[PDB]
Design a binder for this molecule. Structure first.
Ligand SMILES: O=C(O)Cc1ccc(Cl)c(Cl)c1
Length: 167
């Protein structure tokens, strides 16, 4: 049993809700919240900007020290940093950004990072401003992630479209 409420069950291990991931994280305080990061951990917009704003920029401060020490992530890669006030940990995962011309084929690699954590609160990788087809992203998620993932979809109309079209 866990603290996630009102999620629709898609598969054995994947659940989905129309929710703001920031508000979800603040309510649940999951062990792991996933950030839809870029390789520089520059948390400007989208989920990253929203999570970082909710940490009062502490996520960005920590991230800048991480990059200064380690250099950028890979597209498809991840790192574990603090969850600050939102979660125990934040798993920063870099899905490909189609609007930057990155290879959509790296989306599966990005979702494989979730398998290192038993339970996660996450957004749909590579959807929204990342420019990928969200139906595709959900399919890759369910076909790749084996651990328990609670997907928080911000856009209402998108949530309805994802559920109605799910195979
Ligand atoms: O939750 C959504 O509505 C879809 C989505 C997923 C990722 C990002 Cl970064 C964004 Cl902006 C939106």
């Amino acid at each position: 049993v866990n603290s996630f409420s009102g999620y629709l069950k898609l598969t054995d291990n994947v659940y989905i809700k129309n929710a703001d991931i920031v508000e979800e994280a603040k309510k649940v305080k999951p062990t792991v919240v996933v950030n839809a990061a870029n390789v520089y951990l520059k948390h400007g917009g989208g989920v990253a900007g929203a999570l970082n704003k909710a940490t009062n920029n502490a996520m960005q401060v920590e991230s800048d020290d991480y990059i200064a020490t380690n250099g950028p992530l890979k597209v498809g890669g991840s790192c574990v940093l603090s969850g600050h006030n939102l979660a125990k940990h934040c798993l920063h995962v870099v899905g490909p950004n189609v609007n930057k011309g990155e290879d959509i084929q790296l989306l599966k690699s990005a979702y494989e990072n979730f398998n290192q954590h038993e339970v996660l609160l996450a957004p749909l990788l590579s959807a929204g401003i990342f420019g990928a087809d969200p139906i595709h992203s959900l399919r890759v998620c369910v076909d790749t992630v084996r651990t328990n993932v609670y997907l928080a979809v911000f856009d209402k109309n998108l949530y309805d479209k994802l559920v109605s079209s799910f195979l």
